[PDB]
Design a protein around this ligand. Structure first.
Ligand code: JGD
Length: 281
């Protein structure tokens, strides 16, 4: 059981050591498409690349590349697209991916500005009456409504394919209170947020995979998927204590490098799953 393992690692202060064993055990696959010179301007960070085998392809004949990975968790029956916060030049690509993958939800775990730098382009409209048109990908995006709460905002968006005039409703789940440094002290508001995304239907197999991002699409984004998958496996298994968070993280790292960036994010993931297990038992 992980509550017991949590106390062992915490009382022995071994979090950096566990985190290093995960780093050394993690898969390494080619990411040749990400490193093509023509893709250089499509990557926010030169050391964060999708693997070729799990990368999302755009259906545009010109350049199919976006920094995004499909994480398929077979036992949990959950898929996720993890991507970087869009760049000024990739906002049209991002919405093209949402359209093509038939996603219902976008989960954003960062602020546009953190530590005095831009972590993400402003890729959604700020006002109902000022819609955004992405000329490169022929999409129109409208803010329909916005519900601002203390820890998160939920926005209803209409995405319109200008080529075919089809429209879809997209839900934007924006977690707004992750601190600039470190992790939240308590996982309560993060769990509430995760249950709100689940309640929306955005994580359900009827729809395409949810799109999850922070700045690089590996740290906070990693915590989100890891918590969700672990809690779902605890519902599904005869013995919930058979769920090993280190094994699940390693399985997810086959699909995208570097998921969970710090020993602090690993500790917070344990805490979120341990606390979430109480609401699930
Ligand atoms: C590659 N990169 C971080 C950028 C590209 C275009 N504008 C801003 C940043």
């Amino acid at each position: 059981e992980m509550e017991k393992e949590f106390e062992q690692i915490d009382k022995s202060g071994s979090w950096a050591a566990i985190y290093q064993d995960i780093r050394h055990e993690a898969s390494d696959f080619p990411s040749r498409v990400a490193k093509l010179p023509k893709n250089k301007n499509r990557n926010r960070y030169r050391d964060v690349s999708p693997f070729d085998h799990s990368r999302i392809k755009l259906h545009q004949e010109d350049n199919d590349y976006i920094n995004a990975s499909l994480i398929k968790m077979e036992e949990a029956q959950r898929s996720y697209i993890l991507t970087q916060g869009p760049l000024p030049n990739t906002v049209g690509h991002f919405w093209e991916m949402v359209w093509e993958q038939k996603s219902r939800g976008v989960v954003m775990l960062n602020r546009v500005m953190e530590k005095g730098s831009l972590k993400c382009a402003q890729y959604w409209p700020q006002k109902e009456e000022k819609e955004m048109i992405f000329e490169d990908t022929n999409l129109k995006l409208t803010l329909i409504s916005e519900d601002i709460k203390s820890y998160y905002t939920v926005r209803q968006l209409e995405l319109e394919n200008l080529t075919t005039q089809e429209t879809r409703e997209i839900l934007h789940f924006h977690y707004t209170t992750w601190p600039d440094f470190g992790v939240p002290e308590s996982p309560a508001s993060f769990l509430n947020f995760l249950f709100k995304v689940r309640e929306s239907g955005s994580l359900s197999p009827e729809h395409g995979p949810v799109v999850v991002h922070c700045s690089a699409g590996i740290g906070r984004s990693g915590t989100f998927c890891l918590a969700d998958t672990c809690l779902l496996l605890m519902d599904k298994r005869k013995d919930p204590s058979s769920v090993d968070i280190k094994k699940v993280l390693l399985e997810m790292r086959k699909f995208r490098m570097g998921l969970i960036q710090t020993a602090d994010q690993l500790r917070f993931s344990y805490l979120a799953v341990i606390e979430g297990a109480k609401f699930i038992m």
